[model samples]
Target: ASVTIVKPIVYGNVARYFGKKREEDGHTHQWTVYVKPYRNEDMSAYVKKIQFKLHESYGNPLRVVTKPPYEITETGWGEFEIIIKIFFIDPNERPVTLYHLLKLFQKKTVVSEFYDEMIFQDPTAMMQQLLT
Candidate 1:
């Protein structure tokens, strides 16, 4: 028999103005991008890691988070599309990719969030065990 597992997740960014642009870096806002379960559920068992691809201007544009509370923090002057990739512990499963635009310079602190579901169909025996 085959089985299906659905995990609800939320991914987004929060931006806060720095009040004034930095004299040296010229960054006007600080932002954090993250991915978490929609509810309070641990996902470390099947989720291997998460990769956040930031703007090229960053020193290291590709940030990999290997634990829960998968997120990255940085400062920038402009908004851009961020690529978020999720990898699973099962080698047979392909990694999933999502995109979110980093927002800043709004009237108040900006919080942009999106919800999605991770669906695993006919997962491997080992993966099924871990998921349950």
Candidate 2:
């Protein structure tokens, strides 16, 4: 007879960008990622730790977070895929890997104060004016 271990885990992520108010190469954004158990379950019951792997330039990018909020934030102008690893409390359980692509520019037309309808002909000048 073989013993089966049940692994019940679910998670989601979010990305936010700074509007034209604070300009940086026409794309100023903060990347945030998080994970939690499904159906309001206790994530801490299964998760032991969370790790975030950032770009190489950000030396020593392997960040270890041990808590329910299993999340991290980053600032950048370009988009990149971040690797998230979730470890289980029980060594018998295998870790989980998730790849999330950061969002920097508007992919579709969004209706909100944070979303802009158009870009200026000269973004450099517009940014300067907005900052000054």
Candidate 3:
């Protein structure tokens, strides 16, 4: 048999939502940033650079907040300049409903229908709003 090549079929950029810190044997550095998109309910975490990607609990903000903002409301909602999801799908495909996005998921989504309630597809309808 010949060698087979298989690229990451679902490669995407990790839409950085969190911060981190690290120290190598010779040096130290402050927090780095990263992000991964929702594929399904497959549990995962990240600490790396951007690449075309997917993830569980995605859009699942893993924030790097500095604790107790000066304007936190009694409702537990903090004053935010804006928590933007800068990450964008290529939008090469049709705007997918949460259900459609779920089908692209490689992993099994148990409660697949619930996601529609969490997010709307209008976000992706811009048709290349993400491309420069």
Backbone clash count, each prediction separately = 0, 0, 12
lDDT of 2 by residue, 8-121 (tens): 444434546555435534546566666654345456654679898877867578988897777776666666767878775656445778776655565322111111111123
lDDT for model 2 comes to: 0.56
* Clash pairs (backbone) in predicted model 1: none
Candidate 3 C-alpha lDDT tens digits along 87-124: 22333333221111212112211111121112223333
Q: Of the candidates numbered 1 and 2, which has the greater lDDT value? A: 1
All candidates in order of TM-score, best leading: 1, 2, 3
Number of the predicted model whose TM-score against the real structure is largest: 1
Provide the overall lDDT of each model, using Cα atoms, as 2-decimal numbers: 0.90, 0.56, 0.22
Which candidate has the top score in lDDT? 1
Q: Find the 10 residues in a row with the least total lDDT in model 3.
A: 70-79
Q: Model 1 — TM-score against the truth?
A: 0.94
Model 1 gets an lDDT of 0.90
